[PDB]
Design a protein around this nucleic acid. Structure first.
Ligand SMILES: [Mg+2]
Length: 539
DNA sequence: GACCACGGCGCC
DNA sequence: TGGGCGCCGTGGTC
């Protein structure tokens, strides 16, 4: 490991240290590069950043993000993490990827660059004759790492003053519920403490314990348990309400405003690219993929997300991408005609299980077909089906068998995936992204059947992901050539920011690029809204 | 202060 | 016996 003075040969492997994991908040403590068997250690890291053509190494996207806040372009290129992730998506961290493919992840820039070259070598050849996963790395993941670096650096604009006024409203509503419940308890206790609540609910008050917690076996105070004791006591509704408010206060309203960045006046997530078993992205520090939208107070928080002045937000949402993906994968003639005909899946699905004349008089069957249609994706069981309808474990089974008479190639796809899973030891997406699921042949049924749900969701969830990522790759350069921005992805939706004048012209472009990303035996449909805020934009 | 397991819950 | 995530407070350890 011979030490050459800094200016490194072109195309070298970078190795960097940050004071903290978040590139947008980090100081560049150290910089290195490696090519052949030579270590080029930068004396002045931020200065040294100017000399690179592209970032190439573990966490390439991170360095490209920090470079971007500093004004420097610098895209990300090869990343052994991206390759390892495609071999086996349980490869999430460089600690692990190193300590599996022949290195040690250290807290030193040069050894991080020495690790990069070494890890990349040992992995790119480990991808010999994986045409499919090489296509995924070239035409999806490497390019996307750039797109994500641009998104992460842009950030999304937030109305702080608005959030701070909320905090004061919600604070006060919390205070009333708090003092209600205590009066009902006949004493005050910490309502954030589920231990203390447990005692209050089940010992002190006389209430029935419905279920128990997994690891420790305490009486559960979850929503599903409290929603089931709604009738039994007026303290329960209050507790439910107090959880709603404190969850949203503690998770979103209170902390988000403090994470505005001095240089931008914007919020910056991290989009982790090698963090999940299916090939979805996750979002982090903070997570903007779980900003609320169901509840009223929830919907008020979402208004806080706004466009720069003079711009608008464009929100684009795929419409049942996962069902459509299933239809494509299963090849169920019946099911794909429901999307080709431009019909309302759950309407038609109800009108096929029961087989009601045409489409007529189905208010409680709409719920019934909707529920099954996502419950085939997660492996929803009869009991669970029986619990969500008010109907018993018996009629619910027949719903399941009926649905498979409606859709016989779904079942055959299901079973085929399971068997090839056991055979090859993994399952895979339409683009050949794989997830190894070795418990498919476990001797304990609970764990086997748990494995099976994991196993047959992955091809659909990962294909929806694959489809979204490829769209992001395709769409982005069209947005840049239009001075539009790409702000967030939320699994099957995209939030873009565009200038008021061109906003409709961006919407149209974005929508069409997404409906046409990779055409299937069904069509992809996309809803689009425009607005000053995320809520308004009509997600 | 930094971190941990847990139960809980927001989103797709 | 519902897939995939990340973050909250509590209660507790160094
Ligand atoms: Mg949506």
């Amino acid at each position: 490991l011979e030490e050459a003075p800094w200016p490194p040969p072109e195309g070298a492997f970078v190795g960097f240290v940050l004071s903290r994991k978040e590139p947008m908040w980090a100081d560049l403590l150290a910089l290195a590069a490696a090519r052949g068997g030579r270590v080029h250690r930068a004396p002045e890291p931020y200065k040294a950043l100017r000399d690179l053509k592209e970032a190439r190494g573990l966490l390439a996207k991170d360095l490209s993000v920090l470079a971007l806040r500093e004004g420097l372009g610098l895209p990300p290129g090869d990343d052994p993490m991206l390759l390892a992730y495609l071999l086996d998506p349980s490869n999430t961290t460089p600690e692990g990827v190193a300590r599996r493919y022949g290195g040690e992840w250290t807290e030193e820039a040069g050894e991080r660059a020495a690790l990069s070259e070494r890890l990349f070598a040992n992995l790119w050849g480990r991808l010999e004759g994986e045409e499919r996963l090489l296509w995924l790395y070239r035409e999806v993941e490497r390019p996307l790492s750039a797109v994500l670096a641009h998104m992460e650096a842009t950030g999304v604009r937030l109305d702080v003053a608005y959030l701070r006024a909320l905090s004061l409203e919600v604070a006060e509503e919390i205070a009333r519920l708090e003092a209600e419940v205590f009066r009902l308890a006949g004493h005050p206790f910490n309502l954030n403490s589920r231990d203390q609540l447990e005692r209050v609910l089940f010992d002190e008050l006389g209430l029935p314990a419905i279920g128990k917690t997994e690891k420790t076996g305490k009486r559960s105070t979850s929503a599903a348990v409290l929603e089931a004791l709604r009738e039994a006591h007026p303290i329960v509704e209050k507790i439910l309400q107090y959880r709603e408010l404190t969850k949203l206060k503690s998770t979103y309203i209170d902390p988000l405003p403090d994470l505005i960045h001095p240089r931008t006046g914007r919020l910056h997530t991290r989009f982790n690219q090698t963090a999940t078993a299916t090939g979805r992205l996750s979002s982090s520090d903070p997570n903007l993929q779980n900003i609320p939208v169901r509840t009223p107070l929830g919907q008020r928080i979402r208004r806080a997300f706004i466009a720069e002045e003079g711009w608008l937000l464009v929100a684009l949402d795929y419409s049942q991408i996962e069902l459509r993906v299933l239809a494509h994968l299963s090849g169920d003639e019946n099911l794909i005609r429901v999307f080709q005909e431009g019909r309302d899946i759950h309407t038609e699905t109800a009108s096929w299980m029961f087989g009601v004349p045409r489409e007529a008089v189905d208010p409680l069957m709409r719920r019934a077909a909707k529920t099954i249609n996502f419950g085939v994706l997660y492996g929803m069981s009869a009991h669970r089906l029986s619990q969500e309808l008010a109907i018993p474990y018996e009629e619910a089974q027949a719903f399941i068998e009926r649905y498979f008479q409606s859709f016989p190639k779904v079942r055959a796809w299901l079973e085929k995936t399971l068997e090839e899973g056991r055979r090859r030891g993994y399952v895979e997406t339409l683009f050949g992204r794989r997830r190894y699921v070795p418990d498919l042949e476990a001797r304990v049924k609970s764990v086997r059947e748990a494995a099976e749900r994991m196993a047959f969701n992955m091809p659909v969830q990962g294909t929806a992901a694959d489809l979204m990522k490829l769209a992001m790759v395709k769409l982005f350069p069209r947005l840049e050539e239009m001075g539009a921005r790409m702000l967030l992805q939320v699994h099957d939706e995209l939030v873009l920011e565009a200038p008021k004048e061109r906003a409709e012209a961006v919407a149209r472009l974005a929508k069409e690029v997404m409906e046409g990303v990779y055409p299937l035996a069904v069509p992809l449909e996309v809803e689009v809204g425009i607005g000053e805020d995320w809520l308004s934009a009509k997600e």
